[PDB]
Amino acid sequence: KVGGNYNYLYRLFRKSNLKPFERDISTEIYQAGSTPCNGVEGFNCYFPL
Amino acid sequence: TRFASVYAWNRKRISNCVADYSVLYNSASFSTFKCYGVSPTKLNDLCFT
């Protein structure tokens, strides 16, 4: 019951397996710039949050 | 290029052959390419009926 609809965040990122008790606060847009992104750089911009 | 209507969608059954999924996600001619349930990368390492 609050208007803060953009204060609770979760991640859909993959290929980032995280070991027990580590933190990854690096907030970067996903741009592989290589073959595994449809072969084009700048596309597949997956927002981590 | 000859594709049927949405109400008369044609069904093609493929089985008993080796499937090459590398070309599918490595072609830029597909504007939209999304897989539900299974990641496209892992599809090359799984076998089905």
Task: Describe the protein in words.
The PDB classes it as viral protein. The entry lists the keywords SARS-CoV-2, Spike protein, viral protein. Cryo-EM structure of SARS-CoV-2 S-UK variant (B.1.1.7), two RBD-up conformation. Chains A, B are Spike glycoprotein. The structure is cut from a larger assembly and holds 2 copies of chain A (49 residues). Chain A is 0% helix and 0% strand. Chain A is mostly loops. The two termini of chain A are 22 Å apart.
Q: Any key phrases for this structure?
A:
part of a larger assembly, 2 chains, 49 residues, little secondary structure, 0% helix, 0% strand, viral protein, SARS-CoV-2, Spike protein, Spike glycoprotein
What's the layout of helices and strands?
The structure is cut from a larger assembly and holds 2 copies of chain A (49 residues).
Chain A: no helix or strand
PDB class: viral protein
Keywords: SARS-CoV-2, Spike protein, viral protein
Entry title: Cryo-EM structure of SARS-CoV-2 S-UK variant (B.1.1.7), two RBD-up conformation
Discrete helix count of chain A: 0
Assembly level = part of a larger assembly
- Helical residue percent band of chain A: under 10%
Indicate the proportion of strand residues of chain A.
under 5%
Question: Can you describe this structure in just a few lines?
Answer:
Chain A: Residues 12-47 are annotated as: Disordered. Chain A is largely without helices or strands and 49 residues long.
